[PDB]
């Protein structure tokens, strides 16, 4: 909320966090995992991997077809600005 003149508190609904609680019904993941289940080797995701998995297939198909141009970088997923998205990657505009 905001404390205005005259020492009066006025709560602001937007500034009050709202807890978005997901539905756990039908979700098969629990706090612990089987010792029977083999552990997976850690492979941290990187921009190279993310681009290859998502963006590369479209360009590869388009490049062979020849329907590729510099103007249409946004077509393959580039965002000219982060404005308009509720969650902006930079500057960060959302809490954890």
């Amino acid at each position: 909320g905001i404390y205005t003149s005259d020492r009066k508190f006025v709560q602001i609904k937007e500034m009050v966090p709202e807890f978005v609680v997901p539905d756990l019904t039908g979700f098969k993941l629990k706090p612990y995992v089987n010792y029977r289940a083999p552990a997976g080797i850690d492979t941290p995701l990187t921009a190279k991997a993310l681009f290859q998995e998502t963006v590369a297939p479209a360009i590869e198909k388009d490049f062979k077809e020849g329907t590729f141009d510099a103007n249409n970088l946004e077509k393959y997923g580039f965002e000219p600005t982060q404005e308009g998205k509720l969650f902006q990657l930079y500057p960060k505009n959302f809490p954890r």
């Binding site: 602001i12 609904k13 937007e14 500034m15 009050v16 966090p17 709202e18 807890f19 978005v20 609680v21 509720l86 960060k92 505009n93 959302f94 809490p95 954890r96």
Partner: protein, 97 residues
Amino acid sequence: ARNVLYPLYQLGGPQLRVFRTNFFIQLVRPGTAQPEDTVQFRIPMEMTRVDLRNYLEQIYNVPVAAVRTRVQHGSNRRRDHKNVRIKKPDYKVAYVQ
């Protein structure tokens, strides 16, 4: 969410939503004698009583009637071998009816 920056809100901004909550709370046996509906909780210092009501009502679907909260000062009398005062972490006790 604690120990994080919340997005600054200006007129026309979205409602603040915390999709993942860092607030951790623990139910404690009341030291004093309280009404049975009243429940004591230890919560992070940055959480508001409204957040607890939303937290319980949303995450745990617990209906809340009234809330009273207090901040307990941690004792700093204790000192270590080096004569440096040791401070007990301050905690907030919430009485939830």
